Amino acid sequence: TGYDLSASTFSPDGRVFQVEYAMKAVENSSTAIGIRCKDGVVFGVEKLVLSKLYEEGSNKRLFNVDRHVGMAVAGLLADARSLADIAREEASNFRSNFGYNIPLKHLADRVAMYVHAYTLYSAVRPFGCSFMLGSYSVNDGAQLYMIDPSGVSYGYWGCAIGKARQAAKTEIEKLQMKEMTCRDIVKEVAKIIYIVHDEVKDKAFELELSWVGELTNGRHEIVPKDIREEAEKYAKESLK
Amino acid sequence: KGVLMYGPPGTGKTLLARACAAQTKATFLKLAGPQLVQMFIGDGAKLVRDAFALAKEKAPSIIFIDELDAIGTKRFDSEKAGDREVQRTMLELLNQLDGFQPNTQVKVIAATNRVDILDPALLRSGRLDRKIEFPMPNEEARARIM
Amino acid sequence: ERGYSFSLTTFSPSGKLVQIEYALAAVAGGAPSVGIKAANGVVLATEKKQKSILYDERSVHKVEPITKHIGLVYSGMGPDYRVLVHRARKLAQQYYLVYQEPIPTAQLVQRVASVMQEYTQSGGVRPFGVSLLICGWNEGRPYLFQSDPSGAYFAWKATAMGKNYVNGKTFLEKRYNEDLELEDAIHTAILTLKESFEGQMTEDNIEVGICNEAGFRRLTPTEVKDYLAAIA
Amino acid sequence: NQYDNDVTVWSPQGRIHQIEYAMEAVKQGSATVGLKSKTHAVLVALKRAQSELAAHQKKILHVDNHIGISIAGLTADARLLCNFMRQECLDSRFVFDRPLPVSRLVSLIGSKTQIPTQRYGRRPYGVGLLIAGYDDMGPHIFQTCPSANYFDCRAMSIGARSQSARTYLERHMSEFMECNLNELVKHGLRALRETLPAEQDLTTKNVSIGIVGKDLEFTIYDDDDVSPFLEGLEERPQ
Amino acid sequence: SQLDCNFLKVVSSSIVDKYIGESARLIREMFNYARDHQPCIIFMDEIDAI
Amino acid sequence: SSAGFDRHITIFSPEGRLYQVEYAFKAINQGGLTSVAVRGKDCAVIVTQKKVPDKLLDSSTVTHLFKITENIGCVMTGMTADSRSQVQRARYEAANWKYKYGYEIPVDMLCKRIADISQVYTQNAEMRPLGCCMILIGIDEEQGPQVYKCDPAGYYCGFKATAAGVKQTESTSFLEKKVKKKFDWTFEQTVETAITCLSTVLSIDFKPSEIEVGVVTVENPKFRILTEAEIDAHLVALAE
Amino acid sequence: CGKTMLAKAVAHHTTAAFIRVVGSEFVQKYLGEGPRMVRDVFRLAKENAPAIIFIDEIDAIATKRFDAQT
Ligand SMILES: Nc1ncnc2c1ncn2[C@@H]1O[C@H](COP(=O)(O)OP(=O)(O)OP(=O)(O)O)[C@@H](O)[C@H]1O
Ligand SMILES: Nc1ncnc2c1ncn2[C@@H]1O[C@H](COP(=O)(O)OP(=O)(O)O)[C@@H](O)[C@H]1O
Ligand SMILES: [Mg+2]
Ligand SMILES: [Mg+2]
């Protein structure tokens, strides 16, 4: 051994294990999925009720970076909201210097170069978080990006991060996200995260949904209660 | 054909194998890992083909191998030194399991607790098919265990 | 970020700096190169073989000029060479902005070798893996100096660096005298590079640069073909 | 274990062991229990001592007129975050002339303690902050941990032998959102007699109570004024 | 499945035993069998043992 | 062949080697990718493949071809996180040439500045030396087209035909038999001889959805990326 | 490099007796066969002719390390 202690050393076959070890820490966080509809992006996070003593609305794994940009995280939660602070701060420097709202192909570029910068030195560790960025503009449409702890970003029609990643994105491609608007998506977002996480592992869990598009007039916010109650009404019909 | 269980050392691997020895009424046959290691040459190799010929005779039979990382350690190229006689017992265990003249009469249950040590020649798909892992008990299983 | 701020080059218990001894092993596995001064100018000749026919040989250069009258070749590893070239290009300018005079070739080697010694003691760095040959004609008389990764320097009449350098130095010892012209030293520099090259020594497998009192210059492959012709 | 030395090094399983060892430091300190009603936020601590003549180490501290905290772990890092806590409250009062909200205070702590959990040669802060306070939204109970992960909760308990206190809080938290200040406190006082050996419980010199209230500034009660609260508890059933 | 009489498959681990010269007696007496049956193929699987 | 920490950081072996760099050359090969660049008589062509394993992924955001300046394009191999960081430097260094010197940077001077930066990583014993490669093309006045490669060791050279990636040696053996018979090269022949390079090495015989081609020519010196429709025009003419 | 080949050409143009042994056949199973097998080669090289002994792969016989326990 000895070839895997620092992030400054390659292996004798040419790969870095400190990044791969931090990628393994993501699959112990639960599940965060997000797909984009024809005219907007819908996030979705199932939230484990660890004990009864916590309060409904605690420790949200679903942030709010800018007025139109949303973030759903998966990983070590202290590093999640630390990456959320620099992304919230990066968009403020764009509007102050250039005058207008930051686009997603630039925002996820500036954040991923900040994540990549900790995969080079021995003085710092790689982050233990993977997360998704989605938004809607009236001149660019809906956007959906995703960033690993190594620093690689791509566009997606729908993605999934958490424990059951392949077992979640198997059913995403059963949908048709090219033509559905962001109303019937909300019922289909919830349904594919009820079929995952058998009740042997967890007793009870919490649904948390997010929502952006021109139906929300460009601003990012949470779903209302009645709409996610319709999805929770559309929960127990997967037993047939 | 061929199952493999692995994981942390206290998760219960022998406990399934001792369970199956009580349930099915077949010819159960067990092995230690370092039992197939002999001072003279070719005796550990002879001892493998004698065991599978015995389980060939009792045609409903399953064979169990505990601590497979004793003999299934990864091969390596080196001059001046290095063990070789252990690989011969491994390379027949590759062949006498699977390859020329195959059979469907015996089933292999293998158990180790470290995987990265093992030779990829014995983890192919045909020799050890279903590689299941044993995770540590999460919360609820510990309430069931004690 | 920051650095390490500790020397990773220490004394052995036998009293030898081991990393400098290893850097001389990388110098000895480089391309062979010879350098000869003879009474009116210095000849620097090296050996440049592309690995395949796909490479553009007119793109990079082994023989580099430092100023109007100073050239410089190497025998070591590639990317370390271009660093201390750009360093030595700059050092010749700060001498010129103070004194309004082209730098003497001795004073350049005073300052290039001071960089290499400073770089084998400071914190968190491995030493260079190149040795140099520096020519030039200051005040009539020519000069030929050789540095090393340790930071020392010498004043050679004729020497060889690279692979089979111990055979070239025996060959030059039986060849060189005090009285040769520049075109004679060119002919014996090709005759000593033929000791270690392949079968075809064409106009683009080698690279030759000369000094005169007219200044340093580098030969085009036209007259290099004429020198390679009627050779050996 | 060579993966067990510095905060920078990841485990091959993906769990940084230096963070997990700072969780062992908060499990060494004595227990404390915080809980809230609709209109109040009460936290109760249990002191310890070294000899019978040395005094008892206090744990409840006063941050502001509407925020108080309770510590568990080594006391030197507790005062390091306490002097950061007081400073961030009175400058917001200096700039905006308003009480700084509680949920916005804790996110400053989570960004404060995450920084030494990523550099080289920097320990985490071993500390056990239970925070009680007032926003404009009523009472709030927050807990932190040396993994820089703060939790929103309605009743928690941390310290040595705290799992027994959590089981008491789960089977009585349906009653907490109705009662006044009197039996809200002695609901929490029945949790501290749960986490003790079966012979000594509450002898009026090792327990402290702090309340912030809807028209009540944050007030600490110590070893004489505890006695009105402490009377009115039944005997331990055996 | 093409020869059936003069095709020799060898596992390259049966050819070794703990006596003195019996390991090399087989390699002599395999190829002596090979010249006696002139159209013949020797197959030697997993030679890394020997 | 090893003594000390020469396997771990960038110091010298007893043989004169240094292993952390030659570990990093085979970090390029883990991408599972191969790119080909061919210089013509009046043009320069880069061809490379793209492998999209998902239907849920946006196929317009996986381009390894990048536009550095208005007249300079490049292709990136190796791992993605280090390659996109190195493009960000090359965009920055070209803009400072124009601001300091008042004219367009030559493509060999840009490759020198990238290789000088990459030299410093294998020169200090602290940083990890960026395991990804670099191939540039461009039109230069009184030089015509020209192609350059920069490796993570700090070496660079001008080529006439270039391969990089997993199948590098098999591609260059194909091209060196093609160039030494010395046929003249038009525009379309350099497009034909570059596609048939990685079509015979990789043995694919593909449809136009898996490769991407950038080009520059001295009638339109703008680096431009070909549409899939006009990729298909060269492809059906390649099958006579 | 023509080691076995040059011995073939010597045996073709000789006028002497040529004795050709493989140097891994002295390890017979029975004890004492080998030392009897060595000494009757040279006795056959004595009685027959001014002959030529050719032994190949002496590494099967002449090594460095031994073990007087096996
Ligand atoms: N003139 C030559 N010089 C060298 N080798 C030749 C020549 N002509 C043919 N060969 C080839 O060289 C091969 C090796 O012959 P030979 O067995 O004598 O080499 P060797 O050194 O004994 O190798 P080994 O010891 O491995 O058997 C022959 O099979 C032949 O094909
Ligand atoms: N329900 C259970 N789950 C896991 N382990 C158990 C359970 N019940 C008992 N055990 C313990 O697990 C042990 C099995 O050992 P095991 O983990 O198979 O050893 P190894 O894997 O190192 O061969 C037994 O000693 C048994 O006491
Ligand atoms: Mg066991
Ligand atoms: Mg031979």
UniProtKB/TrEMBL annotation, chain E:
Mg(2+) 3 binds at residue 46. Mg(2+) 2 binds at residues 45-46. It is found in: Cytoplasm; Nucleus. Belongs to the AAA ATPase family. This is 26S proteasome regulatory subunit 10B. The chain holds residues 203 to 252 of 403 of the full protein.
